[PDB]
């Protein structure tokens, strides 16, 4: 089902540094609703800049330690048939 | 260097169909310039919708036969240090 695709870039050199997917949330788009982004209309449809208020809400799903002072972050909401 | 990330979905069902990276162009941003998308000033941003005019400009770098009448395409301009 739904997975969050997080990518980060260095603010200085601005090169693509890393990427990490969240666990599969299945058909529940609550995580997106909690971010203020409608589910059905925004999946597989572009990237969103990660703002400060999003950091703590997203952190529990990633091993990468999100630091918006050093990196620029983008999140895209990908959806595919269960079990990736 | 620069690599173009092409992802496409079925235009009817809306299901993911495939994804393919182009070769590494190094610091040659000519392909982006031909699309009318400033090289340095547009890498590592969101993704763009591929319009018909872009098809012949991109086709030489992908094995997949680009067909917009059947699929919907997105392209991202990813830039990382060399040797990826
Ligand atoms: Zn994107």
**In which domain, by residue range, is B12 found?**
1-84
CB contact under 8 A, A15 and B79: yes
Instruction: Report the alpha-carbon distance of residue A70 to residue B65 in Å, rounded.
Output: 39
Can you tell me whether residue A60 is helix, strand or coil?
helix
Nearest alpha-carbon partner for A32 in A9, A61, A71? A61
SS (H, E, C) chain B: CEEEEEEEEECCCCCEEEEEECCCCCCCCHHHHHHCCCCHHHCCCCEEECCHHHHHHHHHHCCCCCCCCCEEEEEEEEECCCCC
Question: Into how many domains does chain A fold?
Answer: 1
Are B59 and B40 in contact by the 8 Å Cβ rule? The answer is no
Resolution (A): 1.8
- Radius of gyration, alpha carbons of chain A: 13
* Structural determination approach: X-ray
CATH number for A39: 3.10.50.20
Chain A residue with CA closest to B17: the answer is A80
Rounded to 5°, the CA angle B80-B36-B52 comes to 105
CB contact under 8 A, A47 and B47: yes
Distance between start and end Cα atoms, chain A: 8
Residues lining ion ligand 1 (Cβ < 5 A) are A 46-47, 76; B 46-47
Chain A residues with CB within 8 Å of chain B CB: 9, 14-17, 44, 46-47, 72, 74, 76, 80-81
The helix or strand, by DSSP H or E, that contains position A32, with its residue range, turns out to be: helix A30-33
Q: Does the CA dihedral B74-B75-B76-B81 come out positive or negative?
A: positive
Are A51 and A35 in contact by the 8 Å Cβ rule? The answer is no
């Amino acid at each position: 089902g739904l997975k969050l695709d997080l990518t980060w870039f260095d603010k200085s050199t601005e090169d693509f540094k890393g990427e990490e997917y969240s666990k599969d949330f299945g058909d529940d788009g609550s995580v997106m609703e909690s971010l203020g982004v409608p589910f059905k209309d925004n999946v597989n449809n572009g990237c969103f800049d990660v703002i400060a208020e999003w950091v703590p809400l997203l952190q529990p799903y990633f091993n990468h330690q999100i630091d918006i002072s050093d990196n620029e972050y983008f999140v895209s909401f990908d959806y595919r048939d269960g079990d990736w």
